[PDB]
Automatic annotation (TrEMBL), chain A:
<protein>
    <submittedName>
        <fullName>Genome-derived Neisseria antigen 1162</fullName>
    </submittedName>
</protein>
<keyword id="KW-0732">Signal</keyword>
<keyword id="KW-0449">Lipoprotein</keyword>
Length: 139, 144
């Protein structure tokens, strides 16, 4: 999978802004990991021209249709399942082969930080440490 | 807090490998965030020379005592609460969860606390993608 189409994430949380800015935050980590990410503005514009702005709609489109349009190897689907305040955010994701709809990868994360103090520095160190541990496990 | 002592993390999971190498993994992100930290090998050796190697013993020491030894402003305590894989027929799912708190080493006051629980399908493990997911989730927390 050289290239990834990231669709707007589904929001299954009570909070509107639960997904605000999230699609944008995926670009950098994915390029770092060696994937070509389809640029967001063009993707947004393509969906709009095709009469789709709603995330639920887009997540319902068959991956084969998406391939017809963009030529992406894969599609990244993200859903925020928790968002609210101690602030907690939880989300899950799957990477799907766009030609056959086969699942390529699946994962989820839930992260909490005491409302009393806010620091992505320390939060970043913690999640990084947890990901380091999984990378070294029996897989 | 500028200087941070990371003590050997507590393992509260059935898996003994649950914390292997974790102490080392905290150095880059902490320095990249601007804190000053000691190398894992240096910390481990100082505890050994002071008669301590067991993480539960260490997490029990009063922070003020730690400050007497290292001169650190704060102490970072990490606990792994889950580590393993649910072995199911069509796929196994690996889960790691940890919680942490940063405390002022002079008076024991808590300065920060957080936790993370991360899961991945075993059939198609991929640190890159798990990385981008946790990274996205932390970004959402940051902008709230």
């Amino acid at each position: 999978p050289a290239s990834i189409l990231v669709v707007p994430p589904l929001n299954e949380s009570p909070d509107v802004n639960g997904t605000w800015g999230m699609l944008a935050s995926t670009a950098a980590p994915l390029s770092e990991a060696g994937y070509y990410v389809f640029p967001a503005a063009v993707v947004e514009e393509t969906f709009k021209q095709n009469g789709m702005t709603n995330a639920a709609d887009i997540h319902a489109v068959r991956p084969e249709k998406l391939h017809q349009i963009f030529g992406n190897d894969a599609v990244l689907y993200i859903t925020v399942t928790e968002y609210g305040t101690v602030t907690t955010v939880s989300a899950k994701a799957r990477l799907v082969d766009s030609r056959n709809g086969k699942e390529l990868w699946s994962g989820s994360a839930s992260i909490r930080e005491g409302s009393n103090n806010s620091n992505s520095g320390l939060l970043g160190m913690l999640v990084s440490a947890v990901v380091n541990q999984i990378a070294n496990s029996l897989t």
